[PDB]
Coordinates of all heavy atoms in Angstrom, one line a residue:
Chain A
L299 N -111.0 231.9 -135.6 CA -111.9 231.5 -134.5 C -113.2 232.2 -134.8 O -113.4 233.4 -134.7 CB -111.3 232.0 -133.2 CG -110.4 231.0 -132.4 CD1 -111.2 229.8 -132.0 CD2 -109.2 230.6 -133.2
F300 N -114.2 231.4 -135.2 CA -115.5 231.9 -135.6 C -116.5 230.7 -135.6 O -116.1 229.6 -135.9 CB -115.4 232.5 -137.0 CG -116.5 233.5 -137.3 CD1 -116.2 234.8 -137.4 CD2 -117.8 233.0 -137.6 CE1 -117.2 235.7 -137.7 CE2 -118.8 233.9 -137.9 CZ -118.5 235.3 -138.0
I301 N -117.7 231.0 -135.2 CA -118.8 230.0 -135.1 C -119.7 230.2 -136.3 O -120.1 231.3 -136.6 CB -119.6 230.1 -133.8 CG1 -120.7 229.1 -133.8 CG2 -120.1 231.5 -133.6 CD1 -120.3 227.7 -134.0
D302 N -120.0 229.1 -137.0 CA -120.9 229.1 -138.2 C -121.9 228.1 -138.0 O -121.7 227.0 -137.5 CB -120.1 228.9 -139.5 CG -119.0 230.0 -139.7 OD1 -119.4 231.2 -139.8 OD2 -117.8 229.6 -139.7
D303 N -123.1 228.4 -138.6 CA -124.3 227.5 -138.5 C -124.3 226.5 -139.6 O -123.7 226.8 -140.7 CB -125.6 228.3 -138.5 CG -125.8 229.0 -139.8 OD1 -124.9 229.4 -140.5 OD2 -127.0 229.1 -140.2
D304 N -124.8 225.3 -139.4 CA -124.9 224.3 -140.4 C -126.0 223.3 -140.1 O -125.9 222.1 -140.2 CB -123.6 223.5 -140.5 CG -123.0 223.1 -139.1 OD1 -123.7 223.4 -138.1 OD2 -122.0 222.5 -139.1
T305 N -140.8 224.1 -139.4 CA -141.4 223.5 -138.2 C -140.5 222.6 -137.4 O -139.3 222.6 -137.7 CB -142.7 222.7 -138.7 OG1 -142.3 221.7 -139.7 CG2 -143.7 223.6 -139.2
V306 N -141.0 221.8 -136.5 CA -140.2 220.9 -135.7 C -140.6 219.4 -136.0 O -140.6 218.6 -135.2 CB -140.4 221.2 -134.2 CG1 -141.8 220.9 -133.7 CG2 -139.3 220.6 -133.3
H307 N -141.0 219.2 -137.3 CA -141.4 217.9 -137.7 C -140.3 216.9 -137.5 O -139.2 217.2 -137.8 CB -141.9 217.9 -139.1 CG -143.2 218.7 -139.3 ND1 -143.9 218.8 -140.5 CD2 -143.9 219.5 -138.4 CE1 -144.9 219.6 -140.4 NE2 -144.9 220.0 -139.1
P308 N -140.6 215.6 -137.1 CA -139.6 214.7 -136.8 C -138.8 214.2 -138.0 O -139.1 214.6 -139.2 CB -140.3 213.5 -136.2 CG -141.7 213.6 -136.8 CD -142.0 215.0 -137.0
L309 N -137.9 213.2 -137.8 CA -137.0 212.7 -138.9 C -137.8 212.0 -140.0 O -137.2 211.4 -140.9 CB -136.0 211.8 -138.3 CG -136.5 210.6 -137.5 CD1 -136.4 209.4 -138.5 CD2 -135.7 210.3 -136.3
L310 N -139.1 211.9 -139.9 CA -139.9 211.3 -141.0 C -139.7 212.0 -142.3 O -139.6 211.4 -143.3 CB -141.4 211.3 -140.6 CG -142.0 210.2 -139.7 CD1 -143.4 210.6 -139.3 CD2 -142.0 208.9 -140.5
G311 N -139.7 213.3 -142.3 CA -139.7 214.1 -143.5 C -141.0 214.9 -143.8 O -141.9 214.9 -142.9
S312 N -141.0 215.5 -144.9 CA -142.2 216.3 -145.3 C -143.4 215.4 -145.5 O -143.5 214.7 -146.5 CB -141.9 217.1 -146.6 OG -141.5 216.3 -147.6
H313 N -144.3 215.5 -144.6 CA -145.6 214.7 -144.7 C -146.4 215.3 -145.9 O -146.6 216.5 -146.1 CB -146.4 214.8 -143.4 CG -147.8 214.3 -143.6 ND1 -148.9 215.1 -143.5 CD2 -148.3 213.1 -144.0 CE1 -150.0 214.5 -143.7 NE2 -149.7 213.2 -144.0
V314 N -147.0 214.3 -146.6 CA -147.9 214.7 -147.7 C -149.1 213.8 -147.7 O -149.0 212.6 -147.4 CB -147.2 214.6 -149.1 CG1 -148.0 215.1 -150.2 CG2 -145.8 215.3 -149.1
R315 N -150.2 214.3 -148.0 CA -151.5 213.6 -148.1 C -151.7 213.2 -149.6 O -151.7 214.1 -150.4 CB -152.7 214.4 -147.6 CG -152.6 214.6 -146.1 CD -153.6 215.7 -145.7 NE -154.9 215.5 -146.4 CZ -155.8 214.5 -146.3 NH1 -155.6 213.6 -145.4 NH2 -156.8 214.5 -147.0
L316 N -151.8 211.9 -149.9 CA -152.1 211.5 -151.3 C -153.5 211.1 -151.4 O -154.1 210.2 -150.8 CB -151.2 210.2 -151.5 CG -150.0 210.5 -152.4 CD1 -150.4 210.8 -153.8 CD2 -149.2 211.7 -151.8
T317 N -154.2 211.9 -152.3 CA -155.6 211.7 -152.5 C -156.0 211.1 -153.9 O -157.1 211.2 -154.3 CB -156.3 213.1 -152.4 OG1 -157.7 213.0 -152.4 CG2 -155.9 214.1 -153.5
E318 N -155.0 210.5 -154.6 CA -155.3 209.9 -155.8 C -156.3 208.7 -155.7 O -157.2 208.6 -156.5 CB -154.0 209.3 -156.5 CG -153.0 210.4 -156.8 CD -151.7 209.7 -157.4 OE1 -151.8 208.7 -158.1 OE2 -150.6 210.2 -157.1
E319 N -156.2 208.0 -154.6 CA -156.9 206.7 -154.3 C -157.2 206.7 -152.9 O -157.0 207.7 -152.2 CB -156.0 205.5 -154.7 CG -154.9 205.2 -153.7 CD -154.6 203.8 -153.6 OE1 -155.5 203.0 -153.6 OE2 -153.4 203.4 -153.6
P320 N -157.8 205.6 -152.3 CA -157.8 205.5 -150.9 C -156.6 206.0 -150.2 O -155.5 205.5 -150.5 CB -158.0 204.0 -150.7 CG -158.9 203.6 -151.9 CD -158.6 204.6 -153.0
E321 N -156.7 206.9 -149.3 CA -155.7 207.9 -149.0 C -154.4 207.2 -148.5 O -154.4 206.2 -147.8 CB -156.2 208.9 -148.0 CG -155.3 210.2 -147.9 CD -156.2 211.4 -147.5 OE1 -156.5 211.6 -146.4 OE2 -156.4 212.2 -148.5
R322 N -153.3 207.8 -148.9 CA -152.0 207.4 -148.4 C -151.3 208.6 -147.8 O -151.5 209.8 -148.2 CB -151.1 206.8 -149.5 CG -151.9 205.9 -150.5 CD -151.1 205.8 -151.8 NE -149.8 205.2 -151.6 CZ -148.9 205.2 -152.6 NH1 -149.1 205.8 -153.8 NH2 -147.7 204.6 -152.4
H323 N -150.4 208.4 -146.9 CA -149.5 209.4 -146.3 C -148.1 209.1 -146.5 O -147.6 207.9 -146.2 CB -149.8 209.6 -144.8 CG -151.0 210.5 -144.5 ND1 -151.4 210.8 -143.3 CD2 -151.9 211.0 -145.4 CE1 -152.5 211.6 -143.3 NE2 -152.8 211.7 -144.6
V324 N -147.3 210.0 -147.0 CA -145.9 209.8 -147.3 C -145.1 210.9 -146.7 O -145.5 212.1 -146.7 CB -145.7 209.7 -148.8 CG1 -146.2 211.0 -149.5 CG2 -144.2 209.4 -149.2
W325 N -143.9 210.6 -146.2 CA -143.0 211.6 -145.7 C -141.7 211.7 -146.4 O -141.3 212.9 -146.7 CB -142.7 211.2 -144.2 CG -143.8 211.4 -143.3 CD1 -144.0 212.4 -142.4 CD2 -144.9 210.5 -143.1 NE1 -145.2 212.2 -141.8 CE2 -145.8 211.1 -142.2 CE3 -145.3 209.3 -143.7 CZ2 -147.0 210.5 -141.8 CZ3 -146.5 208.7 -143.3 CH2 -147.3 209.3 -142.4
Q326 N -141.0 210.6 -146.8 CA -139.8 210.6 -147.6 C -138.7 211.6 -147.0 O -138.4 212.6 -147.6 CB -140.1 211.0 -149.0 CG -139.1 210.7 -150.0 CD -138.4 211.9 -150.6 OE1 -139.0 212.8 -151.0 NE2 -137.0 211.9 -150.5
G327 N -138.2 211.1 -145.9 CA -137.1 211.9 -145.2 C -135.7 211.2 -145.5 O -135.6 210.3 -146.3
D328 N -134.7 211.8 -144.8 CA -133.4 211.3 -144.9 C -132.8 211.2 -143.5 O -133.0 212.1 -142.7 CB -132.5 212.2 -145.7 CG -131.0 211.8 -145.8 OD1 -130.7 210.7 -145.3 OD2 -130.2 212.6 -146.2
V329 N -132.1 210.1 -143.2 CA -131.6 209.9 -141.9 C -130.1 209.5 -142.0 O -129.6 209.4 -143.1 CB -132.3 208.7 -141.1 CG1 -133.8 209.1 -141.0 CG2 -132.2 207.4 -141.9
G330 N -129.5 209.4 -140.9 CA -128.1 209.0 -140.9 C -127.2 209.8 -139.9 O -127.7 210.7 -139.2
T331 N -126.0 209.4 -139.7 CA -125.1 210.1 -138.8 C -124.8 211.5 -139.2 O -124.3 212.3 -138.4 CB -123.8 209.3 -138.7 OG1 -123.3 209.0 -139.9 CG2 -124.1 208.0 -137.9
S332 N -125.1 211.9 -140.5 CA -124.8 213.2 -141.0 C -125.6 214.2 -140.2 O -125.1 215.3 -139.8 CB -125.1 213.3 -142.5 OG -126.3 212.6 -142.8
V333 N -126.9 214.0 -140.0 CA -127.8 214.9 -139.2 C -128.0 214.3 -137.8 O -128.0 215.0 -136.8 CB -129.1 215.1 -140.0 CG1 -128.9 216.1 -141.1 CG2 -129.6 213.8 -140.5
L334 N -128.3 213.0 -137.7 CA -128.5 212.3 -136.5 C -127.2 211.7 -136.0 O -127.0 210.5 -136.0 CB -129.6 211.4 -136.6 CG -131.0 211.9 -136.1 CD1 -131.4 213.1 -136.8 CD2 -132.1 210.8 -136.3
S335 N -126.3 212.5 -135.6 CA -124.9 212.0 -135.2 C -125.0 211.1 -134.0 O -124.1 210.2 -133.9 CB -124.0 213.2 -134.9 OG -124.6 214.0 -133.8
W336 N -126.0 211.2 -133.2 CA -126.1 210.3 -132.0 C -126.4 208.9 -132.4 O -126.3 208.0 -131.6 CB -127.2 210.9 -131.1 CG -128.5 211.1 -131.8 CD1 -128.8 212.2 -132.6 CD2 -129.7 210.3 -131.7 NE1 -130.1 212.1 -133.0 CE2 -130.7 210.9 -132.5 CE3 -130.0 209.1 -131.1 CZ2 -132.0 210.4 -132.7 CZ3 -131.3 208.6 -131.2 CH2 -132.3 209.3 -132.0
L337 N -126.8 208.7 -133.6 CA -127.1 207.3 -134.1 C -125.8 206.5 -134.1 O -125.9 205.2 -134.2 CB -127.8 207.3 -135.5 CG -129.1 207.9 -135.5 CD1 -129.7 207.8 -136.9 CD2 -130.1 207.3 -134.5
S338 N -124.7 207.1 -134.1 CA -123.4 206.4 -134.0 C -123.3 205.6 -132.8 O -122.5 204.6 -132.7 CB -122.2 207.4 -134.1 OG -122.4 208.3 -135.2
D339 N -124.1 205.9 -131.7 CA -124.1 205.1 -130.5 C -124.7 203.8 -130.6 O -124.9 203.1 -129.5 CB -124.7 206.0 -129.4 CG -123.9 207.2 -129.1 OD1 -122.9 207.4 -129.7 OD2 -124.4 208.0 -128.3
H340 N -125.1 203.3 -131.7 CA -125.8 202.0 -131.9 C -125.2 201.3 -133.1 O -125.9 200.7 -133.9 CB -127.3 202.2 -132.1 CG -128.0 202.9 -131.0 ND1 -127.8 204.3 -130.8 CD2 -128.9 202.5 -130.1 CE1 -128.5 204.7 -129.8 NE2 -129.2 203.6 -129.4
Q341 N -123.8 201.3 -133.2 CA -123.1 200.6 -134.3 C -123.1 199.1 -134.1 O -122.4 198.6 -133.2 CB -121.7 201.2 -134.5 CG -120.7 201.0 -133.4 CD -121.1 201.3 -132.0 OE1 -122.1 202.1 -131.8 NE2 -120.4 200.8 -131.0
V342 N -124.0 198.4 -134.8 CA -124.0 197.0 -134.7 C -122.8 196.3 -135.4 O -122.6 196.6 -136.6 CB -125.3 196.4 -135.2 CG1 -125.3 194.9 -135.2 CG2 -126.5 196.9 -134.3
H343 N -122.1 195.5 -134.7 CA -120.9 194.9 -135.3 C -119.9 196.0 -135.8 O -119.3 195.9 -136.8 CB -121.2 193.9 -136.4 CG -121.9 192.7 -135.9 ND1 -121.5 191.9 -135.0 CD2 -123.1 192.2 -136.3 CE1 -122.3 190.9 -134.8 NE2 -123.4 191.1 -135.6
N344 N -119.8 197.1 -135.0 CA -119.1 198.3 -135.3 C -119.5 199.0 -136.6 O -118.8 199.7 -137.2 CB -117.6 198.0 -135.4 CG -117.1 197.0 -134.4 OD1 -117.3 197.2 -133.2 ND2 -116.6 195.8 -134.8
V345 N -120.8 198.8 -137.0 CA -121.4 199.5 -138.1 C -122.7 200.1 -137.7 O -123.5 199.4 -137.1 CB -121.6 198.5 -139.3 CG1 -122.0 199.3 -140.5 CG2 -120.4 197.7 -139.6
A346 N -122.9 201.4 -138.0 CA -124.0 202.1 -137.5 C -125.3 201.5 -138.1 O -125.6 201.6 -139.3 CB -123.9 203.6 -137.9
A347 N -126.1 201.0 -137.2 CA -127.4 200.4 -137.5 C -128.5 201.0 -136.7 O -128.4 201.3 -135.5 CB -127.4 198.8 -137.3
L348 N -129.6 201.2 -137.4 CA -130.8 201.9 -136.8 C -131.4 200.9 -135.8 O -131.8 199.8 -136.1 CB -131.8 202.3 -137.8 CG -133.0 203.1 -137.3 CD1 -132.5 204.6 -137.1 CD2 -134.2 203.0 -138.2
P349 N -131.6 201.4 -134.5 CA -132.3 200.5 -133.5 C -133.8 200.3 -133.8 O -134.4 201.2 -134.5 CB -132.1 201.3 -132.2 CG -132.1 202.7 -132.6 CD -131.4 202.7 -134.0
Chain B
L257 N -147.6 247.4 -125.9 CA -146.8 247.5 -127.1 C -145.6 246.6 -127.1 O -144.8 246.6 -126.2 CB -146.4 249.0 -127.3 CG -147.4 249.9 -127.9 CD1 -148.3 250.4 -126.8 CD2 -146.9 251.0 -128.7
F258 N -145.5 245.7 -128.1 CA -144.6 244.6 -128.1 C -144.4 244.1 -129.5 O -145.1 244.4 -130.4 CB -145.0 243.5 -127.1 CG -143.8 242.8 -126.4 CD1 -143.2 243.3 -125.3 CD2 -143.4 241.6 -126.9 CE1 -142.2 242.7 -124.7 CE2 -142.3 240.9 -126.3 CZ -141.7 241.5 -125.2
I259 N -143.4 243.2 -129.6 CA -143.2 242.5 -130.9 C -144.3 241.4 -131.0 O -144.7 240.8 -130.1 CB -141.8 242.0 -131.0 CG1 -141.5 241.5 -132.5 CG2 -141.6 240.9 -130.0 CD1 -141.8 242.6 -133.5
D260 N -144.7 241.2 -132.3 CA -145.7 240.2 -132.6 C -145.2 238.8 -132.5 O -146.0 237.9 -132.1 CB -146.3 240.5 -133.9 CG -145.4 240.2 -135.1 OD1 -144.1 240.2 -134.9 OD2 -145.8 239.8 -136.2
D261 N -143.9 238.5 -132.9 CA -143.2 237.3 -132.9 C -143.5 236.4 -134.2 O -142.9 235.4 -134.4 CB -143.3 236.4 -131.7 CG -144.4 235.4 -131.6 OD1 -145.3 235.4 -132.5 OD2 -144.4 234.5 -130.7
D262 N -144.5 236.9 -135.0 CA -144.9 236.1 -136.1 C -143.8 236.1 -137.2 O -143.6 237.1 -137.8 CB -146.2 236.7 -136.7 CG -146.9 235.7 -137.6 OD1 -146.4 234.6 -137.8 OD2 -148.0 236.0 -138.1
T263 N -135.9 225.4 -145.6 CA -136.4 226.3 -146.7 C -137.4 225.5 -147.6 O -137.2 224.4 -148.0 CB -135.2 226.8 -147.5 OG1 -135.8 227.4 -148.7 CG2 -134.3 225.7 -147.9
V264 N -138.5 226.2 -147.9 CA -139.6 225.6 -148.6 C -140.1 226.6 -149.6 O -140.4 227.7 -149.3 CB -140.7 225.1 -147.7 CG1 -142.0 224.9 -148.5 CG2 -140.3 223.8 -147.0
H265 N -140.4 226.1 -150.9 CA -141.0 227.0 -151.9 C -142.4 227.3 -151.4 O -143.1 226.4 -151.0 CB -141.0 226.3 -153.2 CG -141.6 227.1 -154.3 ND1 -142.9 227.4 -154.5 CD2 -141.0 227.8 -155.3 CE1 -143.1 228.2 -155.5 NE2 -141.9 228.4 -156.1
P266 N -142.8 228.6 -151.5 CA -144.1 229.0 -151.0 C -145.3 228.3 -151.6 O -146.1 227.7 -151.0 CB -144.1 230.5 -151.2 CG -142.7 230.9 -151.4 CD -142.1 229.7 -152.1
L267 N -145.4 228.4 -153.0 CA -146.5 227.8 -153.7 C -146.5 226.3 -153.6 O -147.6 225.7 -153.4 CB -146.5 228.3 -155.1 CG -146.2 229.8 -155.3 CD1 -146.3 230.2 -156.8 CD2 -147.3 230.6 -154.5
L268 N -145.4 225.7 -153.8 CA -145.3 224.3 -153.8 C -145.6 223.7 -152.4 O -146.3 222.7 -152.2 CB -143.9 223.8 -154.2 CG -143.5 224.1 -155.7 CD1 -142.0 223.9 -155.9 CD2 -144.3 223.2 -156.6
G269 N -145.1 224.4 -151.3 CA -145.4 224.1 -150.0 C -144.6 222.9 -149.4 O -144.4 222.9 -148.2
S270 N -144.3 221.9 -150.2 CA -143.5 220.8 -149.8 C -143.2 219.9 -151.0 O -143.9 220.0 -152.0 CB -144.3 219.9 -148.7 OG -145.6 219.6 -149.2
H271 N -142.1 219.2 -150.9 CA -141.7 218.3 -152.0 C -141.5 216.9 -151.4 O -141.1 216.7 -150.3 CB -140.4 218.8 -152.6 CG -139.9 217.9 -153.7 ND1 -138.6 217.4 -153.8 CD2 -140.6 217.4 -154.8 CE1 -138.5 216.6 -154.9 NE2 -139.7 216.6 -155.5
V272 N -141.7 215.9 -152.3 CA -141.6 214.5 -151.9 C -141.2 213.7 -153.2 O -141.8 213.9 -154.2 CB -142.8 213.9 -151.2 CG1 -144.1 214.3 -152.0 CG2 -142.7 212.5 -151.0
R273 N -140.2 212.8 -153.1 CA -139.8 212.0 -154.2 C -140.5 210.6 -154.0 O -139.9 209.7 -153.5 CB -138.3 211.9 -154.2 CG -137.6 213.1 -154.9 CD -137.9 213.1 -156.4 NE -137.5 211.9 -157.0 CZ -136.2 211.6 -157.3 NH1 -135.2 212.4 -157.0 NH2 -135.9 210.4 -157.8
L274 N -141.7 210.5 -154.5 CA -142.4 209.3 -154.6 C -141.8 208.4 -155.7 O -142.3 208.4 -156.8 CB -143.9 209.5 -154.7 CG -144.9 208.4 -154.9 CD1 -146.1 208.6 -154.0 CD2 -145.4 208.3 -156.3
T275 N -140.8 207.7 -155.3 CA -140.0 206.9 -156.3 C -140.5 205.5 -156.5 O -139.8 204.5 -156.2 CB -138.5 207.0 -156.0 OG1 -138.2 208.3 -155.5 CG2 -137.7 206.6 -157.2
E276 N -141.7 205.4 -157.0 CA -142.3 204.2 -157.4 C -142.3 204.1 -159.0 O -141.7 205.0 -159.6 CB -143.7 204.0 -156.8 CG -144.7 205.0 -157.3 CD -145.5 204.5 -158.5 OE1 -145.7 203.3 -158.6 OE2 -145.9 205.3 -159.3
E277 N -142.9 203.1 -159.5 CA -143.0 203.0 -161.0 C -144.4 203.5 -161.5 O -145.4 202.7 -161.2 CB -142.7 201.6 -161.5 CG -143.0 201.4 -162.9 CD -142.3 202.5 -163.8 OE1 -141.1 202.8 -163.5 OE2 -142.9 202.9 -164.8
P278 N -144.5 204.6 -162.2 CA -143.5 205.5 -162.7 C -143.1 206.5 -161.6 O -143.8 206.8 -160.7 CB -144.2 206.2 -163.8 CG -145.6 206.3 -163.4 CD -145.9 205.0 -162.6
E279 N -141.9 207.0 -161.7 CA -141.4 208.0 -160.7 C -142.2 209.3 -160.8 O -142.4 209.8 -161.9 CB -139.9 208.2 -160.9 CG -139.4 209.5 -160.4 CD -139.3 209.6 -158.8 OE1 -140.4 209.5 -158.2 OE2 -138.2 209.6 -158.3
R280 N -142.6 209.8 -159.6 CA -143.4 210.9 -159.6 C -142.9 211.9 -158.5 O -142.6 211.5 -157.4 CB -144.9 210.6 -159.3 CG -145.5 209.6 -160.2 CD -147.0 209.8 -160.3 NE -147.8 209.7 -159.1 CZ -148.0 208.6 -158.5 NH1 -147.6 207.4 -159.0 NH2 -148.7 208.6 -157.3
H281 N -142.8 213.2 -158.9 CA -142.5 214.3 -158.0 C -143.9 214.8 -157.6 O -144.7 215.1 -158.4 CB -141.7 215.3 -158.6 CG -140.3 214.9 -158.9 ND1 -140.0 213.8 -159.6 CD2 -139.1 215.5 -158.6 CE1 -138.7 213.6 -159.7 NE2 -138.1 214.7 -159.1
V282 N -144.1 215.0 -156.3 CA -145.3 215.5 -155.7 C -145.1 216.7 -154.8 O -144.1 216.7 -154.1 CB -146.0 214.4 -154.9 CG1 -147.3 214.9 -154.3 CG2 -146.3 213.2 -155.8
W283 N -146.0 217.7 -154.9 CA -145.9 218.9 -154.1 C -147.2 219.1 -153.4 O -148.3 219.0 -154.0 CB -145.4 220.1 -154.8 CG -144.0 220.0 -155.3 CD1 -142.9 220.5 -154.6 CD2 -143.6 219.5 -156.6 NE1 -141.8 220.3 -155.4 CE2 -142.2 219.7 -156.6 CE3 -144.2 219.0 -157.7 CZ2 -141.4 219.3 -157.7 CZ3 -143.5 218.6 -158.7 CH2 -142.1 218.7 -158.7
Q284 N -147.2 219.5 -152.1 CA -148.4 219.8 -151.4 C -148.2 221.1 -150.6 O -147.2 221.3 -149.9 CB -148.7 218.7 -150.4 CG -150.0 218.9 -149.6 CD -150.7 217.6 -149.3 OE1 -150.2 216.8 -148.4 NE2 -151.8 217.3 -150.0
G285 N -149.1 222.1 -150.8 CA -148.9 223.4 -150.1 C -150.3 224.1 -150.0 O -151.3 223.6 -150.4
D286 N -150.2 225.4 -149.6 CA -151.3 226.3 -149.5 C -151.0 227.6 -150.1 O -149.8 228.1 -150.0 CB -151.7 226.4 -148.0 CG -152.9 227.4 -147.8 OD1 -153.4 227.9 -148.8 OD2 -153.3 227.6 -146.6
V287 N -152.0 228.2 -150.7 CA -151.8 229.5 -151.3 C -152.9 230.5 -150.9 O -153.2 231.4 -151.6 CB -151.8 229.4 -152.9 CG1 -150.4 228.8 -153.3 CG2 -152.9 228.6 -153.4
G288 N -153.6 230.2 -149.8 CA -154.7 231.1 -149.4 C -154.1 232.5 -148.9 O -152.9 232.7 -148.7
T289 N -155.1 233.4 -148.8 CA -154.7 234.8 -148.4 C -154.2 234.9 -147.0 O -153.6 235.9 -146.7 CB -155.9 235.7 -148.6 OG1 -156.9 235.4 -147.7 CG2 -156.4 235.7 -150.0
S290 N -154.4 233.9 -146.2 CA -153.9 233.9 -144.8 C -152.4 233.9 -144.8 O -151.8 234.6 -144.0 CB -154.4 232.7 -144.0 OG -155.8 232.7 -144.0
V291 N -151.8 233.2 -145.7 CA -150.3 233.1 -145.8 C -149.9 234.2 -146.9 O -149.2 235.1 -146.5 CB -149.8 231.8 -146.3 CG1 -148.3 231.8 -146.7 CG2 -150.0 230.8 -145.1
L292 N -150.4 234.1 -148.1 CA -150.1 235.0 -149.1 C -151.1 236.2 -149.1 O -151.9 236.4 -150.0 CB -150.1 234.3 -150.5 CG -149.2 233.1 -150.6 CD1 -149.1 232.6 -152.0 CD2 -147.9 233.3 -150.0
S293 N -150.9 237.1 -148.1 CA -151.7 238.3 -148.0 C -151.5 239.2 -149.2 O -152.4 239.9 -149.7 CB -151.4 239.0 -146.7 OG -150.0 239.4 -146.7
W294 N -150.3 239.2 -149.8 CA -150.0 239.9 -151.0 C -150.8 239.4 -152.2 O -151.2 240.2 -153.0 CB -148.5 239.8 -151.3 CG -148.1 238.4 -151.6 CD1 -147.8 237.4 -150.8 CD2 -147.9 237.9 -153.0 NE1 -147.5 236.3 -151.4 CE2 -147.5 236.5 -152.8 CE3 -148.0 238.4 -154.2 CZ2 -147.2 235.7 -153.9 CZ3 -147.7 237.6 -155.3 CH2 -147.4 236.2 -155.1
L295 N -151.1 238.1 -152.2 CA -151.8 237.5 -153.3 C -153.3 238.0 -153.4 O -153.9 237.9 -154.4 CB -151.8 236.0 -153.2 CG -152.1 235.2 -154.5 CD1 -151.1 235.7 -155.6 CD2 -152.0 233.8 -154.2
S296 N -153.8 238.6 -152.3 CA -155.2 239.0 -152.3 C -155.4 240.2 -153.2 O -156.6 240.5 -153.5 CB -155.6 239.4 -150.8 OG -156.9 239.9 -150.8
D297 N -154.4 240.8 -153.7 CA -154.5 242.0 -154.6 C -155.1 241.5 -155.9 O -156.0 242.2 -156.5 CB -153.2 242.7 -154.9 CG -152.9 243.6 -153.8 OD1 -153.4 243.5 -152.6 OD2 -152.0 244.5 -154.0
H298 N -154.7 240.4 -156.5 CA -155.2 239.8 -157.7 C -156.6 239.3 -157.5 O -156.8 238.2 -157.1 CB -154.3 238.7 -158.3 CG -154.5 238.5 -159.7 ND1 -155.4 237.5 -160.2 CD2 -154.0 239.0 -160.8 CE1 -155.3 237.5 -161.5 NE2 -154.5 238.4 -161.9
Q299 N -157.6 240.2 -157.8 CA -159.0 239.8 -157.6 C -159.8 240.2 -158.9 O -159.7 241.4 -159.3 CB -159.6 240.4 -156.4 CG -159.4 241.9 -156.2 CD -160.0 242.5 -155.0 OE1 -160.6 243.5 -155.0 NE2 -159.8 241.8 -153.9
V300 N -160.6 239.3 -159.4 CA -161.5 239.6 -160.6 C -162.9 239.6 -160.0 O -163.3 238.7 -159.3 CB -161.3 238.5 -161.7 CG1 -161.4 237.1 -161.1 CG2 -162.3 238.7 -162.8
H301 N -163.7 240.6 -160.5 CA -165.0 240.8 -160.0 C -165.1 240.9 -158.5 O -166.0 240.4 -157.8 CB -166.0 239.7 -160.5 CG -165.8 239.4 -161.9 ND1 -166.0 238.1 -162.4 CD2 -165.5 240.1 -163.0 CE1 -165.8 238.1 -163.7 NE2 -165.5 239.3 -164.1
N302 N -164.0 241.6 -157.9 CA -163.8 241.7 -156.5 C -163.7 240.3 -155.8 O -164.0 240.2 -154.6 CB -165.0 242.5 -155.8 CG -165.2 243.8 -156.5 OD1 -166.2 244.1 -157.1 ND2 -164.2 244.7 -156.4
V303 N -163.3 239.3 -156.5 CA -163.1 238.0 -156.0 C -161.6 237.6 -156.2 O -161.2 237.6 -157.3 CB -164.0 236.9 -156.6 CG1 -164.0 235.6 -155.9 CG2 -165.4 237.5 -156.8
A304 N -160.9 237.3 -155.1 CA -159.5 237.1 -155.1 C -159.2 235.8 -155.9 O -159.6 234.7 -155.4 CB -158.9 237.0 -153.7
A305 N -158.5 235.9 -157.0 CA -158.1 234.7 -157.7 C -156.7 234.9 -158.3 O -156.4 236.0 -158.8 CB -159.1 234.4 -158.9
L306 N -155.8 233.9 -158.1 CA -154.5 234.1 -158.6 C -154.4 234.1 -160.1 O -155.2 233.5 -160.8 CB -153.6 232.9 -158.0 CG -154.1 231.5 -158.0 CD1 -154.1 230.9 -159.4 CD2 -153.3 230.7 -157.0
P307 N -153.4 234.8 -160.7 CA -153.3 234.8 -162.1 C -152.6 233.5 -162.6 O -152.1 232.7 -161.8 CB -152.3 236.0 -162.4 CG -151.6 236.2 -161.1 CD -152.5 235.7 -160.0

């Protein structure tokens, strides 16, 4: 019997400013039921689909 | 009298997998003395510059 653990920027991911050309912004995050377990509440045709 | 209250690689600052053609790894961060107060020691001609 023991409890173990496993900024506040959203699920977008690490925002980066791209200055190579006319500027771009990239986040490159990861989503899914692994971290966003509540997404299971939208399983389309019994398959978890992002609303 | 009270407490002041003040994982990512420090120098890199952030990572992103910009997986276009060609595949590029990109990092964006800050190394100023505001964060790296320790880094202020390395100064040439009394001007702080990282080695």
